[PDB]
Amino acid sequence: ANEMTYEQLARELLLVGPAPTNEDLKLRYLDVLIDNGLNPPGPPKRILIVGAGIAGLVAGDLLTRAGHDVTILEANANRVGGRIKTFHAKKGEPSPFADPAQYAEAGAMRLPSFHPLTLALIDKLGLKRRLFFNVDIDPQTGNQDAPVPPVFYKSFKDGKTWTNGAPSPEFKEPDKRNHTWIRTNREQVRRAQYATDPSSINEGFHLTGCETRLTVSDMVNQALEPVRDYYSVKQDDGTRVNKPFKEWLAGWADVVRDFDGYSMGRFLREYAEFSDEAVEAIGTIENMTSRLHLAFFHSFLGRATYWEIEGGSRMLPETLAKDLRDQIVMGQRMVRLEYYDPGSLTGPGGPAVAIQTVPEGATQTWTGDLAIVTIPFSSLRFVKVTPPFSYKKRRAVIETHYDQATKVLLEFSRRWWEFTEADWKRELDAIAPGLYDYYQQWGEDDRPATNAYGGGSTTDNPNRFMYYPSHPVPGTQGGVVLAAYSWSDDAARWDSFDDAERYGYALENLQSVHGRRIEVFYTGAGQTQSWLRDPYACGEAAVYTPHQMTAFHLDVVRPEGPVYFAGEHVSLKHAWIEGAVETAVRAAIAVNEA
Amino acid sequence: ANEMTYEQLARELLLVGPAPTNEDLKLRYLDVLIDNGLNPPGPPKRILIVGAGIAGLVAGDLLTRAGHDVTILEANANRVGGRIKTFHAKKGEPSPFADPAQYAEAGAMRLPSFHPLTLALIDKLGLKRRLFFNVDIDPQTGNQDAPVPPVFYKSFKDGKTWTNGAPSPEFKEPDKRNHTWIRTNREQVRRAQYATDPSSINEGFHLTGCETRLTVSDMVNQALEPVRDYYSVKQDDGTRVNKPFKEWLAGWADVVRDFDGYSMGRFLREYAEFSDEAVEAIGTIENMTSRLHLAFFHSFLGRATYWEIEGGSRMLPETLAKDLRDQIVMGQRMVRLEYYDPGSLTGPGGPAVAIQTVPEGATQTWTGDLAIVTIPFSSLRFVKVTPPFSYKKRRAVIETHYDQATKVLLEFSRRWWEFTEADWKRELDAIAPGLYDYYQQWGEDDRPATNAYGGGSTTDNPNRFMYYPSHPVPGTQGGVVLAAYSWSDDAARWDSFDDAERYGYALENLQSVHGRRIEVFYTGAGQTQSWLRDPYACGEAAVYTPHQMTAFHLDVVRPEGPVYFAGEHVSLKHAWIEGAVETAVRAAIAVNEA
């Protein structure tokens, strides 16, 4: 009965269908979203969708295009897209950065190539995608002028493959350079230096013995290898292939069983037997610190390739919205939801769903035959739901935590991160004679040139993670850095500062890593995003605690009479867009054939 | 080496001194704070204190009264006391509630009688204390007119006792009635009904088998009994006495060893082998839900007696502040801290400590010989500290989480919670003839009279916990309810609403439990406290995750050259005032005899 549950969860995880068939639901979603859409088996239905983030838009588009009467209620008054949010200049208000060409991501910023549906959907919309440099690169290497590789998916069904165009064999990502920084414990090296000799940064973390000699990267990878062995095999090639479907699924089932009880921290301590100092170091270097006490699965799931969308992530939501001007109602917030499930405004023969919204944050009533709720559970918590959902669904709405996240963006007049030392001499002397020599004397609070292209630097200071844009905005001399990106307590302290203080601290921190002298190129333009203070999100992502997945995720996905659910949290890919998209499709399929 | 650490932690927990002596540090603190103060072994020193919450005030008072030159830097511009915060009318601004006599607690509200130092300190200041009714009472029982019992502490040193006055044998707390509500899963009973037959509320939680038959109270107690047996023994009397010092300390040491690896949730699931449904129920009814994933110790530690201070909790901080008008600098926020530890503004023979503050949130520099930092670690995180603290102290500042907490207070023109049904007829008909009959017809959204005195009601809805004042404010007809008190995700959603929406939702929720008809007595006055948005707190309390205590708490308490630390987080009584007070004294003792 437990084994039965683990099997069911693994199917959820791996997108596998019921037993007499074992379908590749990745193929079904691709087909439907991309190739064919939906065909209604009978008359169009009235359908209501709450939330005009990516999940609500995707399902809205599919159900509209198949001929259904769709209404999309979005609490936000001026913005669709939810946790897809770009700071961009818009005609009629001042530009978010001094240079009005500049833009930057408030929310989602990178898309994995092991995430097909979202990449397929971007291509289908004829949006242009480029490589997101998660590690800093050599930009006089690779071939990015060649066409973007088509989406290429391989099924477990054997020989079944899905693509959306012809190969691009001459396309090639740039070499990773790893010239960016690790600054922990008042020590500082380049990622490449750490890789060749990790003791430098490890002694600062007070790792001793055989740990000192190992990178945090290798530690985490080795730790996970036995886990991986449950559903796959490292061949003599040194490569990894999934086992046969049965032993591959039972394996993932046995992963659920043996490891959902753990947090990442307890896994590293207890299973991989690492020192508290190693876990400390792993957390800081590998962005795990604040999620160590949360489910191992959250960290476990998520040289791979990442993608950004020319013009910012917003293009994906906004493009979809163009097809749905007629269906999208902005500035309406669901406060009540009533539905009729055989086994006041609803009933037999009357409408089966009734939603009531209020303006912004008047009292409209909306009715229909079926519903999709795509709003985060944080926000669902404060909606009055007339017949309660199932016990475990209600528990899921109560118990699912959302992590705080804040981003802090600083515009620079130049892309100082690229500069060689020589570049710094040129670029400072250009502002005033002697300015190089000045910053050279003055020095720092108790730095060599970064000379990096994309990627980011990692630190223990509150900024934590600093990302450089992967691609320059055509024709501009400057760029926007993600100066601070932090979670949990840090975020909350970032939030409670004044704009000036927050941008001051973010710059002091950037300066601690990069040099005082970066101050000269700051334009005084900064933007902040505080996902906790977002009324319609209250965080970045649904992050589960140990055993939560096991105890109620199968109830998260279930319909509730005529009410269906989609969104990032509905999937087992928490913190990603694919999950919201996979589940939008899934939802859309379901309400179509009801 | 592990056993050695567990022993040391248990001494920290139990306030036991080093081995060749094994002193009762509760006796030392009482003596010093209450009876004698401190005697400096040599010349007075310059001492700087950061934070004018309870810890900074207590140590400020002790060190000033012993003759030292103390300065207290408090970032807040108009308010001392920190997480001790009362909403009270103050001459010159409008009253926080329509009735200007009314007040209510934003922060700390109740003091345990198993917490001597703070109770002793309230008596020593000649502040008046009354019983805090954590469970609702029969108010025609007990004797509270008799003198307040003196603080009476018993040491483990054998026959050593501490009191601050003569006995009060005729003083007697009121009988617990338990007429207040449990409203979970759209079901509702009185605590007393649950106690006699818990199946009603338990089936709503889908507890089955032998759990259905048991109260959550009894489940938690039984669960903890074996743990308790490690350092104590349940005698045939049915009572519990601590074992002999050695087996009592080794026991607490073995508690640290065997259980710090757990969260409360994992303890209940894995150790006490409870169903996920029972843990669900336990969490909701026993206020554990949001802290299930945090350390078992946090929940484990904290028919016992509680105390409130006539005039509000603020009296304790504010009274202390009167003695320290000359030492307290308001509106100054530490941004930098520099110190000289043999083994710029500081050095040998120069001053040993230098702090720099900024106005509110100009750049003053403050120097001295020794320092106490009593600010929460959330706030310490963003202070520049010139020689870094020890590695594990820095890790503690980084890794110690603070929980979000929000309180929502609603003034009522009458104390409807007291009313019998008859009282409701009288009190509504008084507003307009027929008004009783009206609310009787109209009814509810799909309630009997509460008729309770003090205590609170517990629910699954976002309010979660609703507390009724224990004592009426003399001469007033109304009262302030704590309508909503919530943590984690709930708090963050509460926070992001508008005052009107927040007070609207809080009242709808109160009405779901108590009756629609309570609406009539609402005065439209409400106050909110959002401890996450407090720049100087960023939460209620330092709450540790599993193993954190084991890995770095011994480093939390250590001095850092001439820098000492006190405050709620410095102790192993997280979430209480005693801990901040015990550690203020401890700190004060230490800097005195340096």
Added chain:
Amino acid sequence: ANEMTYEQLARELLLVGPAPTNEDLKLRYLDVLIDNGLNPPGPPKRILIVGAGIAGLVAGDLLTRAGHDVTILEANANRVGGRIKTFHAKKGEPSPFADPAQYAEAGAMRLPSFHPLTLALIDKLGLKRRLFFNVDIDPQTGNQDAPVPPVFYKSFKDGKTWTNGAPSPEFKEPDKRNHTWIRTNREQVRRAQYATDPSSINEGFHLTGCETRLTVSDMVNQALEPVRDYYSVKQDDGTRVNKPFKEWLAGWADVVRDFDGYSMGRFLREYAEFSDEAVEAIGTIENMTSRLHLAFFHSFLGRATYWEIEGGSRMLPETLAKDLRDQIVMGQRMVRLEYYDPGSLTGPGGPAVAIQTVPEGATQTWTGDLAIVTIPFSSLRFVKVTPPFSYKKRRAVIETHYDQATKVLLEFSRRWWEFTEADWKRELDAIAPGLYDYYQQWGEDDRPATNAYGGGSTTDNPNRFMYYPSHPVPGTQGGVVLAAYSWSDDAARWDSFDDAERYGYALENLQSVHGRRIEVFYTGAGQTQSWLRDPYACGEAAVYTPHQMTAFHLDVVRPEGPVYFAGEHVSLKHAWIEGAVETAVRAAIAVNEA
């Protein structure tokens, strides 16, 4: 010595012969019963057979046809066939149901297609067989007009197969619909509804956690899968094939060893670790309740195909009896049995067997050379046996329990179970205008149309199991329902009621499931069978308790000097006819070649 016993028991279970050969005794029985009969190796013998149920008739026919002098003594005065009993109209007495064409089964009603010998024997007698709908079907699907599939058996001997005619490839059973009812805990759904969402009925059973999400069907199947794996393998096809003979037999041997110690209840609780609530639910839904405390094997053994015999089950016994008019003595009950086993009326050179009967329930003496006793052990218990049987045989007669079973049959003037709602309007308005509208208002004791064809409904009320006839009797408008079929305590209470009260309660119960309005079509004709009060049965079946099989079943089958044994109980297929038939043949083979 234990392993030796388990091996021997598995051979018994699987019909495998001794080691130097390992014959398929299914092939021997088919050959003998069906193709060839028996050839006596020497002169015909005098043979006496007790009991003219299926086992006594089968062996009587074989031994008569091979030329032996057979006498069959049947205690019953007017009826052969034993637990094969049909209520049918017979010229000269009133019809059992108002419509004299109607008939129904008192005893055995369905024959599995995994039971070859009995199906072969029905074909050989040129009796017509049709599908027994154990689950309700879609009757506008399948092909039953095609010839009945021939009996097709596959041996473990490899490539050895047995059939009794040419294939019928166009014959095809109807699709299962599952529109019949589950009514448990005052809740009611269609089997198909339970299958798609089992929580409805499961919450009524107070299953929680991961059980709530699973059907009782899937639970039982999964539970048994590891057991199955002992002697077979689930191939990647998702199908199941027996392992190689040696590992297949050792496997069944290891099944005997590891699981005969269990009851079904203790298996589900202890081995499959199910909640007492799940076992409750499993018992009620899957007809196991009253046999949970009996051997796991009983339940373990017994989408498969079932057969009924046109004209009722009686045809099989009665047809056989026609060939044996000369051998069958009716109305004689064995009271004494005397026999001469070298190592009064019997002795050396005298006759070797002597039986004494009494009329009905005069004192005839019957002699002969060999005997077969086919009477149930309940009845054998009260027979005086001159030289005692072996100790363990005597223990088997004492200790083998027979389960009480009662059937209650109610004739209806129409087959209301078939009806759509529309059909009900038509069929009630036909009795009197408004009658539909009447029952619609009046309603029920605190029901939708069944609209089902064959199968049955399952409930917790005393009826327990209600079966609808699979095929209409040609030319009739009505039908007989098996309204109540119950075991153990229920049966005994059914029994002690008056005909009118029993038929009243059975109808109230039917009405609780199906609708009050079914009352109109009741003809006031009902029949009861109480197998406990049957003097010649005293129950339905020999049902073993845990370990009984292990301790004495090898002694059950052994001859006792010239006395052989056959019948349902002699086999390891307790509760079936095949077992009585397999053992009749086995017996007949043995006495032939003595």
